[PDB]
From a paper:
We recruited AP2 FLAP (henceforth AP2) onto phospholipid membranes containing PtdIns(4,5)P2 and TGN38 YxxΦ cargo in the same physiological buffer conditions used for single-particle cryo–electron microscopy and imaged them by cryo–electron tomography. AP2 coated, and in some cases tubulated, the preexisting liposomes. Compared to the closed form, Cμ2 has moved to form a planar membrane-binding surface, and its movement with respect to the β2 N terminus has freed up the YxxΦ cargo binding pocket, which has a density consistent with that of a bound cargo peptide. The [ED]xxxL[LI] cargo motif-binding site on σ2 is accessible to membrane-embedded cargo owing to a movement of the N terminus of β2 relative to σ2. Our structure of AP2 on the membrane shows that the open conformation did not result from this or other crystal packing artifacts. We observed three sites at which the AP2 electron density contacts the membrane: the proposed PtdIns(4,5)P2-binding site on the α subunit whose mutation abolishes AP2 membrane binding and two putative PtdIns(4,5)P2-binding sites on Cμ2, the simultaneous mutation of which inhibits membrane binding and reduces CCV nucleation. The first Cμ2 site corresponds to a basic loop including K167, Y168, R169, and R170 following the μ2 linker helix, which undergoes an extended to helical transition between closed and open AP2 (11). This location suggests a direct physical connection between membrane binding and stabilization of the open AP2 conformation and points to interference with this linkage being the explanation for why an R170W mutation impairs CME and causes neurological defects. The second Cμ2 contact appears to be mediated by residues K350, K367, and R368 within a basic patch also containing K330, K334, K352, K354, K356, and K365. We do not observe a membrane contact at the proposed β2 N-terminal PtdIns(4,5)P2-binding site.
Numbering used by the authors:
A (entry chain B): 4 to 582
B (entry chain M): 1 to 135, 142 to 223, 236 to 446
C (entry chain S): 1 to 142
D (entry chain A): 9 to 621
E (entry chain P): 1 to 6
The structure:
Amino acid sequence: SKYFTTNKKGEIFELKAELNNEKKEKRKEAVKKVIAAMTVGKDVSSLFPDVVNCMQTDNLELKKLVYLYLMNYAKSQPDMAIMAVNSFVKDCEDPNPLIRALAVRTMGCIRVDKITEYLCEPLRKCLKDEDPYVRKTAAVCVAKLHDINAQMVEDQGFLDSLRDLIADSNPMVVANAVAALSEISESHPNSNLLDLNPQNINKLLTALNECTEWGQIFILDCLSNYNPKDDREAQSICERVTPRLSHANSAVVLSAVKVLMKFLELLPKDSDYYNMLLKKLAPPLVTLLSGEPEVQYVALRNINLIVQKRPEILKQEIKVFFVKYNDPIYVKLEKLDIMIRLASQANIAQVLAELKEYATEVDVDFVRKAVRAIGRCAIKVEQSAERCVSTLLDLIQTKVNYVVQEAIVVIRDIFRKYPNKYESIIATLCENLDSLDEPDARAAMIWIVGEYAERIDNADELLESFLEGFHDESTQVQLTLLTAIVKLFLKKPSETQELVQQVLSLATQDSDNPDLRDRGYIYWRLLSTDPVTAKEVVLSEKPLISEETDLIEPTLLDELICHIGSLASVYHKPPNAFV
Amino acid sequence: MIGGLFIYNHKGEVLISRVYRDDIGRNAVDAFRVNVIHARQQVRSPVTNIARTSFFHVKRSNIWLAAVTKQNVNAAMVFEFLYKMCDVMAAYFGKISEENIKNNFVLIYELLDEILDFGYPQNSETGALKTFITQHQTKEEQSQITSQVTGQIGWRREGIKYRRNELFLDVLESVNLLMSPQGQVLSAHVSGRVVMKSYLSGMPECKFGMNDKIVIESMEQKLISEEDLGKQSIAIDDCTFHQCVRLSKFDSERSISFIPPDGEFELMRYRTTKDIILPFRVIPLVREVGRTKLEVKVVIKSNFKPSLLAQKIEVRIPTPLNTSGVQVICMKGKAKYKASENAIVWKIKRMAGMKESQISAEIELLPTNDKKKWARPPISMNFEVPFAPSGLKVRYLKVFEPKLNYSDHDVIKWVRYIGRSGIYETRC
Amino acid sequence: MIRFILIQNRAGKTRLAKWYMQFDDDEKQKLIEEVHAVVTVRDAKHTNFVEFRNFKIIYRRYAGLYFCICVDVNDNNLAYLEAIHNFVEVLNEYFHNVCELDLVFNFYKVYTVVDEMFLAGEIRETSQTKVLKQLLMLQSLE
Amino acid sequence: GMRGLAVFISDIRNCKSKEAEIKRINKELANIRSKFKGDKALDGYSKKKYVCKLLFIFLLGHDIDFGHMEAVNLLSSNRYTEKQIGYLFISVLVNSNSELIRLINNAIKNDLASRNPTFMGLALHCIANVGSREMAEAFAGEIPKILVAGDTMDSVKQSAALCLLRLYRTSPDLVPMGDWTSRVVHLLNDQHLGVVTAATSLITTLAQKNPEEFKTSVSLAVSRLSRIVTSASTDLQDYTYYFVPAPWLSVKLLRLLQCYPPPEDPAVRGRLTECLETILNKAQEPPKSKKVQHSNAKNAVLFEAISLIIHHDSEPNLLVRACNQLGQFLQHRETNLRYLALESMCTLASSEFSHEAVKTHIETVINALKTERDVSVRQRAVDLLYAMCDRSNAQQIVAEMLSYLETADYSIREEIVLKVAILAEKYAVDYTWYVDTILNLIRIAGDYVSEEVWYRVIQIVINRDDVQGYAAKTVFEALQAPACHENLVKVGGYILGEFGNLIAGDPRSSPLIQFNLLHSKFHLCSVPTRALLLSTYIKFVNLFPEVKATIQDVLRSDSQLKNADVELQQRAVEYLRLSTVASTDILATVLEEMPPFPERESSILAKLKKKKG
Amino acid sequence: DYQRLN
């Protein structure tokens, strides 16, 4: 087994020389050099003659290494596979069922059209087999057969046989059957797997209770596809889930929570086993975050997902999100984030104490996130908003733009929720235009402009300055300037005429976005038409949005429920978004 | 289900190239290497997506491990598999390194392909694996392996013989403690597991008792027998199990059934986040003198039975960084200072229970406490202690061999109760 | 012009680092590692002039040695390839079937002769007989 | 002649456990440091040994923070090897402490005063590499006084030439010229090509600065170069390598003259024509030699001469010869051969003269790139066909290019689809079929294309005024395609918003259905798409009243009322307060067919060009 | 800690 990791420079001919020794030693060591070549990814297909002539043998390890080499290299050379099928036949006549299953998996690891018929009835006899490994590998290589050509009446009869093998006593064979069919559902005639029925549900549930975690998770995802017709059967099902606590958990737990939430839509008055689970769920969720950094990391993903979906009793377990030094930066991040999401009106004093503590730590990123979160707390209960005022102000006075940069947008949104309250800071902001580098923050300042260009009288000179930026800035910045100027001309028509006219000419003739150009169109054919009418629409208030603070698309969330446990949900990006 | 699973060194070349899907490309693999294995930035994640392609690549050690897939799976089971893999690698040959992989190559490959075929992950019960999976069958052996596969019993159970039937348990209780530096236990939790070392014949199912829903109540029953309303025993805040238990049996009657394997293993891990016993009463706190001096006050009241003797008592008391004038206080133990970590190591040879050693410190400074300021490093006590903090202990223990001869009495039992308090940190 | 001149062994490490601009530890090291990886993955049908994401190197592979000389976009690769071949001839000629250990004790000789016939990022000289002549007559300069 | 150095090489070469390396390093450290930090240094053996060690260790991943004034002591040390290791050290170890640099430049001026070859040569070598501005300060005209004002030999002179060429390519500011033409052009007439090569190099530099300065060059240069071609290798035998005539110097001369304009002269450039015939008629022969190096040099100077002829193309016969040669050239079994041939061809590709003659090789290119398994060659071929493309070929070119692109890399995918699209517009007259082509493009990916591309095609559409009904109908077709490509969504949505009336007498034309459909897509996109769709939705009513009431009901949903942003808030606001509250005349009043966009220049080209490196 | 139990 010892490393060889050598192939080059005529030592292929030394490989020959030792291959020019049928004796076992040179053969095995040469083989190990072949494995070296295969690992380092250097083809040794030239040995297929040598490999096949020495391949007349009976050694198990030799059989296995030949299996691997032959398979993965006939992948690169389908021609000489003629040699292979003969041996594979010989093995399918080798009474060792384990060696037979190894032959079956090596063989069914390749599919073109010919080995297919060579194995078909032998394959059916692996279905008409009684060994868990032979039938097991049979199902696995039936799945592997579905790699391609999975449209044939032969493969369909195999599908019928295995489809009845869905009913199977052998835990191994039935388990990989479930796994296989669940994967085959990904073959999308969208009419896959018509074997679902209540008694089947019960028997596979029992199996799950007694079969390995593999089959259990397979059953779980299959149930994630079966749609019960009411809650009573779902009641009994959640009873079957009752013992699905601590196991080889993480996967099982995520999938179980998936299947449950799939049925967890009725009321906790409809059943209290519902609310029994709701209350009982917190400590296992802690264990999820008390597991291993990567699995606690996944757990944090899923927990944010849950809080989004289910804002409930976890509202008292923020303790888990209590950041520490040793905690890794992003884990600390989500900790603090859901801490804010688990707004503890009691702790908000000491919470914000901790928050400014964090502000006094040594990373830009989490600091910016915390500034945003504190701003959200200002968007939350008003009391907080005053300490937010003071703190974010002194943070401005830290004179590190990036903080203040996103803080500009934060305060923009706060003042959107809470306008004409602390305009006093707008004065300070006036100096802070010589650092505009964030289209978000710049747009926030221009939003302020549009807001209070009636109170802002110095708006004139600063705006004719800002006219330096007409090109080389992202369209939303333009549009923000345009609507701010529109607001201004509405509130101060006295001196916006030259401004609106030049900016309209420019943005409409230098336009590339038809929405921008025709927006200038609308702007004039409303303001040339009837500003007297424009003000009523525009200058009237535009109601708020009422505390979004990073909401979720429900349906997306609702559909990622079909993924909570799978990469899509945990990744919080649509399964479609990645292919 | 999954394709390539490649183990990597630091220099980035494969330590294995274990593929399980056609889609897998060499162009893909080398890209993965040069981009994840090599990257100017150094903040990453064990999972990685590159062009809508998942990459669970982990360094479970100095040695790495890359799991490549472009199929939406449960990442959690992927990682479970990775664990089980490296864990059984250890179990079979301890250390896992270059030679550990090399001189195991063939077994590695056949196992991986078996335990996971085309990405379809098979079990790793290893009920008799290492026997024939050893670093040539008989009819009896053929049928035997076929049946043991079909046999729904694992963890090395075929009916064994041990010249004696004895088990030694060790209850480890990790002290998960944070207390306010002024004195208030912010975190009062315990993380413990039931590791079971057994030397018994046959394949016995065993049961066991550990006081529930109440504070605790063959040759030695117990030296600390469970007095009524005894030591802290609670509804286990979280009780974690392992695949020998029967949680159906539990949630039916709050009792699993476990057929344990032989030798050492972890029967069940558990956590309780409440009801603990404090070993000391320390109020470690720092004060600041304008900005030219930071002063730390550490009054370490130890609180256990004086009969209890903790040894090698080393408490971490960080000294202020800027150090101009030191002010030392000594009560009992040994004065040790830590430079390059700027710490008073009030290292005490040993401590009995219910004690108190106070060290008050002043360290003169230069103003650096600004919008960014001194990091207050939690003062921690680190030492040796075996302990049953909750004292939730053996309510009973039911072991047998209900097949041939050796009964409960024919088994001799043990346990240890090793507290674990390195989590005794607070300054801020 | 000649950006630099790197020569590495089959044992990895660049056995001659010769530069013509103010490259730096980070830069030189990246160059070494990247070029080395490329040489490894580059198989036999290749050229002697690989572009690296903004410009090329005139590289020359040998069973043990890998002579890599960096230029940018325009230099007629062939001429420089023949120049490198010439220089190799000169070396093993004078170094009389050089083993690496020779230059391990005489790397400076190779370096100063490079400096001789190549200068300022360009070929200072190419004249085989005269090169050998002047070398030998000045391979006696204490 | 010195133990420590050699014995150290010996041992540390045999040390392998990096800690043992470190130990040997620290032993030499004690040795050398203490020998310099105390234990005063000795002159020949000790200095040479330790300093060569220091230099090579500095190279080994270390540095020397001393012995540099003592390296001046090496320069002021008897053995040439000491002065030489100082030369190298200071040349290898960039210096500081300008007094060091002061002594350095002083010693340099001395090594110049020492008018022996070696001193001056090594001095110029350190001047070039160390390259302190003070050199070209003190030697602005002094290095001229080296290379000229005294003209003796080659080696040291091209040494000074490369030195001064460094100092000039780096600091021409410290170079006042006046005029030195005659000397260097007589060097161009010098048969001692040792100088003449580096000469022509630096002269080519100055001619990049001043071509006009050198027309006197032209005649003597073309005479001498015609000679070089005709006088190949019979003499100057060590100016002769594999019997090629002065390849580097000839290429220098040809590329230099290439700065100068195309052929205009009858006789001088008649002699040029003679050389052209010479070159081509000599390259055509198979090699009596059997070594690729000869082929290498011949093809190199071939590229040089052809390039010199390239970009003129006033030479129809010569262009034919070149086309034939290239035709043969895309058959040479080494990928690099046909590759560089592809570069040369795509270079020449723009020949209005030989456009058709190249286009003849279109299928050659096609099967080659299909049977290629490389891309470099393929991009050369893309540029080749690009320069020569036209409507006729383009018809199929679309098909084959797309069939290739569907399997390719990703950035290059964008650049290629963009360049072929702008090719299409260069030939777009079959605007309906071109629209279909664009539909196919989007259908391929339609999710990676940048903004100005579909911007441009939309402008084209509104500027096309011919297929807008067809366009709208086909857009609808693409819309009932179940899949989604947000670029398609934006573009075609807007189009039907303005052109859906042009496809209306059909059952599928049913703004109710497609409206609710887009609504199902409405809130699953990026933000700007939502603004586009808002414009489209407000177009809908005033162009399709039947759906209005429903549109009214729907645009009042909390979503657009609670859309977090400011903008979409206001956009939905100005839409609703005008729909819900509707004068019903301002609707049509505002609504306008969005006239064909005013003329532009498709800056997509310049954008791709800046992307072009 | 090293103690006998049963």
